[PDB]
Design a protein around this ligand. Structure first.
Ligand SMILES: Cc1c[nH]c(=O)[nH]c1=O
Length: 130
């Protein structure tokens, strides 16, 4: 229905805004674009499902997220990929893991404060009906 399409458009607007706020945070610069294979040649071999905030925006725009839960799975993926690819005690790895955890926690915190639970429940119910 057109009311349903209006719901999903509102979702997309909300998600772009959260994603923009994450993307402009200097701590998260490393997560804003896909990994450069020149710079990191084995990345695309080790990490099976690369994700980054530019790709998140492309997916919002492609109507691939019908719920905040689906969006959060991709935020989670950005984080788990970083924990998997940089697991060492070395300070570079530890820095990127900290930042990955901060990205995830920040996204969850924004969503906890700003997403109405009934809005999300509506999205989920429309999704389940299709
Ligand atoms: C996204 C990313 C970039 N560079 C790295 O060394 N590791 C990563 O996980």
């Amino acid at each position: 229905s057109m009311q349903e399409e209006d719901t999903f458009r509102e979702l997309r607007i909300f998600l772009r805004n959260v994603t923009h706020r994450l993307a402009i945070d200097k701590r998260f610069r490393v997560f804003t674009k896909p990994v450069d294979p020149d710079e990191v040649p084995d990345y695309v071999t080790v990490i099976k499902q690369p994700m980054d905030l530019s790709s998140v925006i492309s997916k919002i725009d492609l109507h691939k997220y019908l719920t905040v839960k689906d969006y959060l799975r991709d935020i989670d993926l950005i984080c788990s990929n970083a924990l998997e690819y940089n697991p060492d005690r070395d300070p570079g790895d530890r820095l990127i893991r900290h930042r990955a955890c901060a990205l995830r926690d920040t996204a969850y915190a924004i969503i906890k404060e700003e997403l109405d639970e009934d809005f999300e429940q509506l999205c989920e119910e429309i999704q389940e009906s299709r």
